[PDB]
Amino acid sequence: SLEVSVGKATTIYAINGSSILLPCTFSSCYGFENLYFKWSYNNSETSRILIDGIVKNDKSDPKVRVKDDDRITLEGSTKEKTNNISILLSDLEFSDTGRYTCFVRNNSATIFLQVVDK
Amino acid sequence: SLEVSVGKATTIYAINGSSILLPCTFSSCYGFENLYFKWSYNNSETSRILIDGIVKNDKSDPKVRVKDDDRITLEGSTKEKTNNISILLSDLEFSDTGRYTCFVRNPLNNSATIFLQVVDK
């Protein structure tokens, strides 16, 4: 049915030492089987995988495949209207400032995360 | 096809005296004809209309119907992969801080939310 979005990208400010939710949802007009998704981190120096996973079908919650940061928790859920593959990043440091890309296969969203003191 | 979103809501910080884009896009697997949309401001006693309009079809850019703030410009466009009905709010003041809602109706309905915080810096 009729869906709305604030876009494929946004900027989030988060507090040093705290946690933050990196939001991403997806949808398909023609269903899906074993959908692959991946969260990655980019800054001007380095790039790396954070977590990836599989959404088996439109009635199964996302499941983690590999994870490269213990501070990350998958916070996904599969419901009638929304396929949620958001992640929680805990114990933030200033070095966590950067671009977070969520890639979905069988498109990409971008979170610009800025870690601040207050 | 395959779409991705950062959600139906976000928070945007903007600078006093400047401008800001309030983003919203919509999608319908069933398509649409003469889709109605409305931007409202919600941190008052009663909600204040900002601008509403119509998207005729998947090949026509959004068009303004009524507008209640001359500081607002529709920045919409209709392309193959994206139905954009964002607006630009110029000449920001601190009183512009609040909740912005973008409502869409297909002749069901849905709504996206922008929490705008105006700061001096």
Swiss-Prot record, chain B:
Keywords on record: Cell membrane, Disulfide bond, Glycoprotein, Immunoglobulin domain, Ion transport, Membrane, Signal, Sodium, Sodium transport, Transmembrane, Transmembrane helix, Transport
Membrane topology, record value: Single-pass type I membrane protein
Gene Ontology BP, a term: positive regulation of sodium ion transport
GO cellular component, one term: voltage-gated sodium channel complex
Residues carrying sugar: N16, N42, N84, N109
Topology feature Extracellular, residues: 2-121
Chief location of this protein within or outside the cell: membrane
Quaternary structure, from the entry: A voltage-gated sodium (Nav) channel consists of an ion-conducting pore-forming alpha subunit functional on its own that is regulated by one or more beta subunits. The beta subunit SCN4B is disulfide-linked to the pore-forming alpha subunit. Interacts with SCN1A; regulatory subunit of SCN1A/Nav1.1. Interacts with SCN2A; regulatory subunit of SCN2A/Nav1.2.
Function, as annotated: Regulatory subunit of multiple voltage-gated sodium (Nav) channels directly mediating the depolarization of excitable membranes. Navs, also called VGSCs (voltage-gated sodium channels) or VDSCs (voltage-dependent sodium channels), operate by switching between closed and open conformations depending on the voltage difference across the membrane. In the open conformation they allow Na(+) ions to selectively pass through the pore, along their electrochemical gradient.
Protein name (record): Sodium channel regulatory subunit beta-4
This protein's encoding gene: Scn4b
Portion of the full sequence shown: 30 to 154 of 228
